[model samples]
Target: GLGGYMLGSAMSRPLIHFGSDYEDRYYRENMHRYPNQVYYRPVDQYSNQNNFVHDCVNITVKEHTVTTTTKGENFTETDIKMMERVVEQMCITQYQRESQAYYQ
Candidate 1:
């Protein structure tokens, strides 16, 4: 439950934006409440260093006819894997200092 807060507690939030032309009804890779949206949580933020939990989640819903990708209705396993890493290394890392909520 990395995105537990969005579930109403503590962690992160979910952001959704409609108008994508994805054939996949569900974001097989999403973690948001909505099956189609993206849920982002900051788990690292400061594990290696005093970093900042700066990230954004995007949930796109199809409402267009010409907004799909060039491949249209096609998805690749490699793409999903790459996106996962991007979220973990680039988006999930945030801030924390020795179990202390270091103030800015």
Candidate 2:
């Protein structure tokens, strides 16, 4: 049987943001149950670094949109379409990896 504590316990926690009110409240209540290492686990340091790179690209795109819009850079239809495509591609890569037999 697998270990009771869970295999990827450290890897997944950093990906979860304490964003929404309900999520914040849940973490506030349950915070003591988790140890500190989960908050600052060492990064992938391996082949899946593409995930980190895409995350950075997405954040940069979003932040740049906000900055540009504040300076009156209106988003045209084509710009919106491109952004949607970028987001969709980010999600699709994860799906593609998981669909492979190695992932199964």
Candidate 3:
């Protein structure tokens, strides 16, 4: 929502859930069974790209500001730490996405 990029629109909740707590246990299991269990499986690529670019830029700004926000002063230590995690997931996801498209 902050940045104007069409990709990497990673935000607090989206990034958090997409990262460490992504709810895909069934999808993982169903991989052997079938993909019919999980919907929008392929859409993950585009959506993920959006998140990657988004947080990359946001993290850059966030680091520049150092707990800064559009409001200018609502951030804290732990919150910014989450930004690092989002970028962490972004790097991993970006690499995975690229590899998947290249060879997949």
Candidate 4:
């Protein structure tokens, strides 16, 4: 949701380059009905503050791979095994908090 309407810009708008005549016509016909969600503005045009959001999201995702990492990161067998153990530990902590078993 934070991506707002910029997702379309990230996509390939290759109608002129690769789409058939009929395909281009169909796309234009439906364009207004289904406006693009993503807008691909040049990265250089964005300010550092705005760019920080993308950077932070990516970094956090990489750190918390199980929940948010991109599937394209190509994690290995060792990473998967380590994640399993980390998740188990995280779950134990969560269970304690949910059960209100924290010590004073």
Candidate 5:
């Protein structure tokens, strides 16, 4: 839920839903069944790290504008949309990995 608030500031929606909604009941059940196994990676480690999600989020920009992007706002609307997809896929990948463990 904390991510929901932070994502709101960035005009983002939850990449994964985990409660109440019938469509998400499986996710909720999985979480309750394997709460300890459900873990998320740190955002800072997503780029330039040994993460499966890294490639999806790696944005190429001018060196001069690196600082602006790092500051979090040097991207074009298209870039922002791409990044949103990256974040969404990252969340799904994490959930799928954990859910697989829970299923096993």
Candidate 6:
């Protein structure tokens, strides 16, 4: 929900801009199932040092400015779209892609 607020400030609607309503509704319905969980990647040795530095591209400009197409903006949808891209990028390292693909 915090992301919702921050995203709103960026003139984004998380579901409308970033996700299919079905996907959004699915997550929303089950959110309470994990009460105290954090869905995003943790800021730790692996993510901050290894993955972000070596695996992903660092955007020098605002993400919104860069991703915006002439058609319109996706202030909210950026996260989901970026997640899909991250999965593709990691696929370059077969081990990384497979290892991160599934979980408990």
Per-residue lDDT of candidate 4, residues 1-104 (tens digit): 54532222212222332245654554455333221222222233343433433443343334456433344444556434433333333333333333354342
Worst lDDT run of 10 residues, candidate 1, spans: 57-66
User: Once superposed on the true structure, which residue ranges of model 3 sit more than 4 Å away at CA?
Assistant: 1-70
Q: What lDDT tens digits, residue by residue, belong to model 2 across residues 1-104?
A: 31221111221222234346665544456433322211111133323445543543455456556766887766656445444444334433433444464556
Give the Å error, residue 73, model 1. Answer: 4.9
Candidate 2, residue 64: the lDDT equals 52
Global lDDT scores for all candidate models: 0.33, 0.41, 0.41, 0.36, 0.38, 0.34
Error of 3 at 51 (Å): 18
lDDT score of residue 89 within candidate 4 = 34
Give each model a TM-score. 0.27, 0.31, 0.36, 0.30, 0.34, 0.23
Encode model 6's per-residue lDDT on 19-91: one tens digit a residue: 5776566445633321121122333323443454233223211342354533364334644454344433332
User: Top TM-score: which candidate number?
Assistant: 3
Better of 1 and 2 by TM-score: 2
User: For every candidate structure, what is the RMSD over all alpha carbons to the true structure, in angstroms?
Assistant: 11.9, 16.3, 12.4, 19.9, 15.8, 14.5
> In model 4, which runs have C-alpha deviations exceeding 4 angstroms?
1-71, 102-104
Which order, best to worst by TM-score? 3, 5, 2, 4, 1, 6
Quote the positional error of residue 71 for candidate 3 in Å: 2.7
Backbone steric clashes in candidate 5, count:
0
* lDDT agreement of model 3 with the native: 0.41
lDDT of 1 at 53: 25
Maximum-lDDT candidate: 3
lDDT of 3 by residue, 1-104 (tens): 53333333332222244344323442243223211110111334434654545555454544545533443655456445654554555444544665588778
- State each candidate's clash count: 5, 0, 9, 8, 0, 2
Model 1 lDDT at residue 42: 40
What is the clash count of model 6?
2
Better of 1 and 4 by lDDT: 4
**What is the per-residue lDDT of model 5 for residues 1-104, given as tens digits with 9 covering 90 to 100?**
42321111122223354344653543344322211111234344343223533432332122213645576644556444433454545445554555568568
- Show model 2 residue runs off by greater than 4 Å: 1-47, 81-104
